[PDB]
Structure 1
Amino acid sequence: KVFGRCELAAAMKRHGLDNYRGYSLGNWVCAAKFESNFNTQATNRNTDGSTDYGILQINSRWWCNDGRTPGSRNLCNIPCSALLSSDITASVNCAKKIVSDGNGMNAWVAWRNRCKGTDVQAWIRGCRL
């Protein structure tokens, strides 16, 4: 499913991401925009053989099992395919574990490069939240 910007802001807010570990909603919407262009079905292969999955491009080296990343850790305890669902619950629950890991939202390279230190409130502007 391809989310609309305000639709995704509302689903993220409902799932408890607004201000989770200090990151306002706009940060999460911005990361999703640049990680996956709001498409829950986005996949991208990394040079190391791992793959990134879903709206927040969560990586199979650490976070999920895809059966093809030798020595992967599966920290979210989830098949990576679960991250591609139109229901963002699994992605959100896994993201919460990731952002708690010590490096906050810097774990998402597009957030670091394209969202960090920008006016992220613009991403929720005009939305009925």
Structure 2
Amino acid sequence: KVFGRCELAAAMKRHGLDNYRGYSLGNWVCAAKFESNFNTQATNRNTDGSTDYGILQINSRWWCNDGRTPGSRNLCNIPCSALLSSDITASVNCAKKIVSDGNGMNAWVAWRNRCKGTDVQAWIRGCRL
């Protein structure tokens, strides 16, 4: 599913991301834009042989099991395929564990490089929330 900007903002808010660990909703929307272009089916291989999955490009190295990432962990206790669903529940719940693990949203390279320190509230401008 490719979400609209405001549609994803609303779904993320419903699922408890607005100000989660102090990150405003616009941070989360910005991150999804530049990780996946708001596409739940996005996948991308990493150099180490892990893969990133879903709207927030969650990494099989640590967070999910995809059956082909040796020596990795599954800290969200999910198949990676769950992160590709049209329903963002699994991606949001796993993102809440990631963002709580000490490094905040710096875990997401795209957030760090394209959202952090910018006017992220712009990502929710005009949305009914």
Fold-level match, TM-score > 0.5? yes
Identical positions, percent: 100
Runs of 4+ displaced beyond 2 Å? none
SS of residue paired to 1:62 = coil
Q: Deviations over 1:71-108 (max 9, x none)?
A: 11100000000000000000000000000000000000
Whole-angstrom CA distance in 1 between matches of 2:48 and 2:36: 20
Whole-angstrom CA distance in 2 between matches of 1:26 and 1:128: 13
Look up the match of 1:115: 115
Deviation at 1:36, TM superposition (A): 0.2
In structure 1, runs of 5+ residues without a counterpart are none
Whole-angstrom CA distance in 1 between matches of 2:93 and 2:31: 16
The size of the alignment, in residue pairs, is 129
**TM (normalized to structure 1)?**
1.00
Deviation at 1:63, TM superposition (A): 0.1
SS of residue paired to 2:76 = coil
Deviation at 1:10, TM superposition (A): 0.1
**TM (normalized to structure 2)?**
1.00
Deviation at 1:125, TM superposition (A): 0.3
Deviation at 1:32, TM superposition (A): 0.0
Deviation at 1:57, TM superposition (A): 0.0
Deviation at 1:11, TM superposition (A): 0.1
Superposition RMSD in Å: 0.2
SS of residue paired to 1:52 = strand
In structure 2, runs of 5+ residues without a counterpart are none
Whole-angstrom CA distance in 2 between matches of 1:31 and 1:88: 14
